[PDB]
Specification:
- The chain is α+β, with helices and mostly antiparallel strands.
- A 4-stranded antiparallel β-sheet has the order 1-2-3-4.
- Helix content is 16%, strand content 52%.
- Strand 3 (35-41) and strand 4 form a beta hairpin.
- The chain has one domain (1-67): Roll (Transcriptional Co-activator pc4, Chain A).
- The structure holds one DNA strand of 3 nucleotides.
- This is Transcriptional coactivator p15 (PC4) C-terminal domain-containing protein.
- One of its GO terms (biological process) is regulation of DNA-templated transcription.
- Residues 17-64 form the Transcriptional coactivator p15 (PC4) C-terminal domain.
- One of its GO terms (molecular function) is DNA binding.
- It comes from Streptococcus pneumoniae (strain ATCC BAA-255 / R6).
Length: 67
Amino acid sequence: EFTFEIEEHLLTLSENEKGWTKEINRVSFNGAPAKFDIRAWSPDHTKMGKGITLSNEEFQTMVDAFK
DNA sequence: TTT
C-alpha cells in the first residue's frame, strides 16, 4: 500500500527529548527514485513523522533562494 | 509524528 526507504542521510537539524530527529534525507517512496525529504524520524527510523518531500528542482530552487 |  505504501513503502519507504532512506537511501541517504544528509543532515540532522535537531533532536527532541524522546529521541526523534528532524532530518534532511534522500528517501525513496514506493520504489520511486529518491527525493529530498525533510521530516521527523523515530530513533531507529522505523516510524515517520510529518514532513515534506521536495523534487531535486524544488530543493535547488530553495537553496538558490536563501543563499 | 506514515508517501
